[PDB]
Amino acid sequence: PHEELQYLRQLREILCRGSDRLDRTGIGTLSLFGMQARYSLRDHFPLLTTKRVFWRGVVQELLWFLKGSTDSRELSRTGVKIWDKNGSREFLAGRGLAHRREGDLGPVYGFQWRHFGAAYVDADADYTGQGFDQLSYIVDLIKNNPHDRRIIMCAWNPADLSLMALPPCHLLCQFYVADGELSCQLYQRSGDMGLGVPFNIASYSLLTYMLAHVTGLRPGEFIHTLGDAHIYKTHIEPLRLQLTRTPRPFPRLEILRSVSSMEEFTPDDFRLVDYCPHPTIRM
Amino acid sequence: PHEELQYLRQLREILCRGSDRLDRTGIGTLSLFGMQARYSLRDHFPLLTTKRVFWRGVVQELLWFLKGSTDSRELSRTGVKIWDKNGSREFLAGRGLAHRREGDLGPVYGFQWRHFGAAYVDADADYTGQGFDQLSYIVDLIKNNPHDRRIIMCAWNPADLSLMALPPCHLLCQFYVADGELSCQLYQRSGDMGLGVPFNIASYSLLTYMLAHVTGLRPGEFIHTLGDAHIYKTHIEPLRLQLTRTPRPFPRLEILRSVSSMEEFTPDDFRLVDYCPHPTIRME
């Protein structure tokens, strides 16, 4: 069976028996708690096909985080605008962080991944040698102690939450090596099933391809674990449309160059082969 | 189907198609990566029955960590010795922590839960007001913002790993409120299927009962998610024995008085009703 049917079955389950809840800000969702799906990375790349996923954004966003940036303006300069709302002075003001220049997202993914536990100043500060470099940590383990059970990169630092533009939805990823293959499990505390989750699956599957490439392994499996899996009520109609569509064969992902470090990738290193999605769906 | 069959199925799957791998310890395991099981908490308590689980240790250990302790001697004094080997001066020296007094585990669960991000000194230091109190954080959300999607307690701080007697296997728990019920998901990076996982299920199910009680909710479900789920090769024969056993109906758990704060529970407050397990299975 097509692995995309896991995601579609998750949508169906939430629509059928999801709890209807309002939060303190007055917005309603349907949700279920606790889900898991598995996507093979071996012969294909799991970029969903029942709608067109924003691959250009997936790639630029991940490279942006990997270099430790917390500046939405540097992502925006690449042509990808998905963090620009969160980096705006008016958004930051709304957060209670008015003391900032446009673009300064606070200690979000890039900072946590490369400098966990360091003292955040701003998005222009030099944090070289400060904090715990989780990316270097996991690359070393995959290379030199691949069977280790602590190959973890974590983005959740509760002491830093009040400084973040947004708290991370992707709390941590764990990696696993067996029989020459690298697998990844993501724990996602909150899954916006309509707008986010297809993009999220692509992000961590890409991360796994990159890590496998750098470490001389082949991609194995991506295990997607969800906490609060939800559908915003305004997304139900477009998702009803999506659910009428039959999945097409997943594309393949090729890496065009020998790359020795997780920091040396560029967007043009990635060749996506035979991606033929159904049309974009605006949620 | 009896919910304990999930755990037994996971054992069978690991034995059948688990990867045979050695660690840096040289000790071999069979393992699989990525599992999930669900245990209802509404009408029973999922204390496993195909072997006798150490309930008294479950209760004492959880209460010890909730109060923020990192002192294995404080647990030992209650009569529960499960952390004594890790808190011994011998083990700690083996870890490169030879300056520690006996019992000083470093910034393990108790410290992370109550003082995340604070600078660890030793097990005797007063950390009042230091770090992020995640226990107070989640209790406040469950009470006042129950549909929030950030009800999380996390024990993984990579910056503190070198100071810990042992790295935590239980990385985080997330809570969820619906229909007057409190549910919990545990992300466990490493599951010792033989010695640890039945005990682990009980720990976080108990935590969920306690939280539900303090916040005026009923317990819902416990969702157990595993990363590296493994069987130690020295555990193969005792687990093959366990697999020949049929689960008995789960016990029930009663809380015997009104408790208004997580820090106020004592082991006196819990009554396990109709626990009828198969005999204890010892494992190396």
Residue numbers in the entry:
A (entry chain A): 51 to 333
B (entry chain B): 51 to 334
Can you quote the paper on this entry?
TS is an essential enzyme for DNA replication. It catalyzes the transfer of a methylene group from the cofactor 5,10-methylenetetrahydrofolate (mTHF) to its substrate 2′-deoxyuridine-5′-monophosphate (dUMP) and produces thymidine-5′-monophosphate (dTMP) and dihydrofolate (DHF). The overall structure of kTS was found to have a similar structural conformation to hTS, except minor differences in ligand binding site and conformational variations in some amino acids.
In apo kTS, phosphate molecules occupied the dUMP binding site. In addition, a dual conformation was observed for the sulfhydryl group of catalytic Cys219, as shown in the electron density map of apo kTS. Arg200’ residue in the apo kTS structure was rotated approximately 145° to the opposite direction of the phosphate group and was not observed to interact with dUMP.
